[PDB]
Amino acid sequence: MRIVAADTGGAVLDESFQPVGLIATVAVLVEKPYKTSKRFLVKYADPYNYDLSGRQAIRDEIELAIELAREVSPDVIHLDSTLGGIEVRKLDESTIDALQISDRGKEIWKELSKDLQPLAKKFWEETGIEIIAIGKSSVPVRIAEIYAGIFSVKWALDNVKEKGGLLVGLPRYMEVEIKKDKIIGKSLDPREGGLYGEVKTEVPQGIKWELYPNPLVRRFMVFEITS
Amino acid sequence: MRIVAADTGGAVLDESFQPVGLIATVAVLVEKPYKTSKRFLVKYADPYNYDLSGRQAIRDEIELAIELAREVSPDVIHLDSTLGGIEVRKLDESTIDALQISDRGKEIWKELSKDLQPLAKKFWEETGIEIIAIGKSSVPVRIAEIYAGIFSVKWALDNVKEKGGLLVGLPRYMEVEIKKDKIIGKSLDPREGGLYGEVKTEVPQGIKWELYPNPLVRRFMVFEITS
Amino acid sequence: MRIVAADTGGAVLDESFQPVGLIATVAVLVEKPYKTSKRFLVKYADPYNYDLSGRQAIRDEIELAIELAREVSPDVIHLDSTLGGIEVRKLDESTIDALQISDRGKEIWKELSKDLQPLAKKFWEETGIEIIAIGKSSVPVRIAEIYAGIFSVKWALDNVKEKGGLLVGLPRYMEVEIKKDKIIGKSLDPREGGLYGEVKTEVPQGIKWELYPNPLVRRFMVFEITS
Ligand SMILES: [Mg+2]
Ligand SMILES: [Mg+2]
Ligand SMILES: [Mg+2]
């Protein structure tokens, strides 16, 4: 199978570890053995002006996934919404209320439906490719998320000399290593079977960084950097 | 404590990783230090003709557990249904509706009750041994599950030359190693404290195998083999 | 951030692994990098005369947290109740029923409210320090819990020659190592990012101990000791 997926991750935090906004939306192509991606797109948000409700993220995600899928012709697109793998082109109001999910989950999706259902329907008509609301069940979605963490660290590297110091909340239970002009991201959960990513990027001189637990959100790490 | 438990696991998958049917039901005897089993029974299903609803599995499980328990006289039997450890001989309709579980969980159990409650009651009258619906809380159930994964890999080894190629979905977050005429199965979750199993079986020549993440089901691995 | 947190853990078990009562309540001060504590208080319960409902634990916890906080002046106290981080001084009845939790969760808290809400309100008036019901989201709460496990092993060491043999159920997925007059406790979950604790205490001669899975409670270990 060849799968395109997308997710958003990486948060700028304040000094009390409260999220200000998110940093990176990433679309990935994933193929066997489904542990990493060698083909991906990133869109950087403005974390100092972000919508933390989930709406902005999923819209950026589905658009970036479609952008990558138009090029690499995957068998399917995985979207990060955990709805049991239903096709997004089928998500009209009546289908959404029938879903076995939360009522505010239904709130958000009945609002998203107006744009996303026609979008997925048109993309399917054009390409035959489904966009499925699989969410946390998807390994390609998790690989996208790990890359969003990696690209959030790239963003921190690229912005810390202007900003002085940054606190970046990473996606759940992942670490990064910074080597000579390379960031490697790895899941911390061995149950996931060895998921990772790598981005080549220039590491500036005159910086120091550290990775440690977010004390307010168990199993999430913080990347702290100063110049 | 000496505990008999049972579970079913291992799925034949198609090329899109969709489950066709399950492969192995295993009953284990587990004693201190509760990390593995050295005494077990296996029943192989026909995965190309299986009931994926859960009904077939739990019936095969309770029968195989009783078969092993009749020999090894455990203190208790653990059944893989997560109902808080209630004795199955007590599971009449009124008790089942009183349970703090899903209504389709109640659906399945009110149907199973007609056979399983009298079965557990009779076994208890004969032996004093309870059959408890403990499910995911039980370590012996997880050890049975790991052995079902192992025996599913044995089944793949034994059938791949006739079948040409096989995709086996393993139970959640476990790996296998194939050594000289031995399969070793291990949990991937260090939180479980080092659970494992081993089955001695002939490894055929002229095969190649690989273990990798199921991209559609996070934290589940696939064993792929060709001849 | 400087955080005080508390939790209770460690259970005396009978020979069928059933809990008799809990052993240690611990308050910790946690600072960057939020992996351990070097400043803590312990209160030992009488496990052979304990209230397993949760009431005794949370009362001992909030009092011990306040006792430590009065000395070390943390920015905040984390209490082990998972209510989304609401301030305990705000937990009147109407707020509790408004919470998005279980109805027996509301049962317990509407009873606790009569003492704990005025207590938290007074402490805040005195110090400006909030007591927040953050629960499982808190890393400092987990570090307190790991120390409760460690101190429960100290309690077992200190009592095994009078008791002959003890079975101690540890907090979820943690291990201990016993070195020369030191107990080291570590989380078994690498997703938590390397949480640990250490207590210096005399290890008696003429004992043997073992750590292994609790077969009735997956991902929880037992510390067994005899003299
Ligand atoms: Mg997401
Ligand atoms: Mg099962
Ligand atoms: Mg607690």
Numbering used by the authors:
A (entry chain A), B (entry chain A), C (entry chain A): 1 to 227
Quote the study that presented this structure, word for word.
Here, we report the crystal structures of PhoExo I, which shares 76% amino acid sequence identity with PfuExo I. In this study, we determined three substrate-free structures of PhoExo I and four structures of PhoExo I in complexes with ssDNAs. PhoExo I forms a trimer in solution similar to PfuExo I. The 3′-5′ exonuclease assay of PhoExo I showed that PhoExo I cleaved an ssDNA from its 3′-end at every two nucleotides, and the cleavage stopped at the third to fifth nucleotide from the 5′-end. PhoExo I is predicted to utilize a DEDE (RNase HIII)-type catalytic motif for the hydrolysis of ssDNA. PhoExo I is a novel RNase H superfamily protein.
In this study, we determined three substrate-free PhoExo I structures using three crystals with different unit-cell parameters (crystals 1–3). Crystal 3 contained two PhoExo I protomers in the asymmetric unit. In crystal 3, each protomer of PhoExo I formed a trimer with symmetrically related proteins that were generated by the crystallographic 3-fold axis. Because the structures of PhoExo I in crystals 1 and 2 were partially disordered, we mainly used the structure of PhoExo I in crystal 3 for the images, unless otherwise stated. In the structures of PhoExo I, each PhoExo I protomer binds one Mg2+ ion among the β1 strand of the large β sheet, the α1 helix, the β4–β5 loop and the longest α4 helix. The Mg2+ ion is coordinated by Asp7, Asp80 and four water molecules in an octahedral manner. Because PhoExo I requires Mg2+ ions for its 3′-5′ exonuclease activity, PhoExo I is predicted to catalyse the hydrolysis of an ssDNA around this magnesium-binding site. PhoExo I forms a hexagram-like trimeric structure using the η3 helix, the N-terminus of the α4 helix, the η4 helix and the β11–β12 loop. In addition, Glu210 and Glu224 of one protomer form two ion pairs with Lys32 of the other protomer. It is noteworthy that two arginine residues in each protomer, Arg191 and Arg219, are clustered at the centre of the PhoExo I trimer, and the positive charges of these residues are neutralized by the negative charge of Asp189, which prevents electrostatic repulsion at the 3-fold axis region of the trimer. In contrast, the binding of a Mg2+ ion near the A site was not observed in the PhoExo I structures.
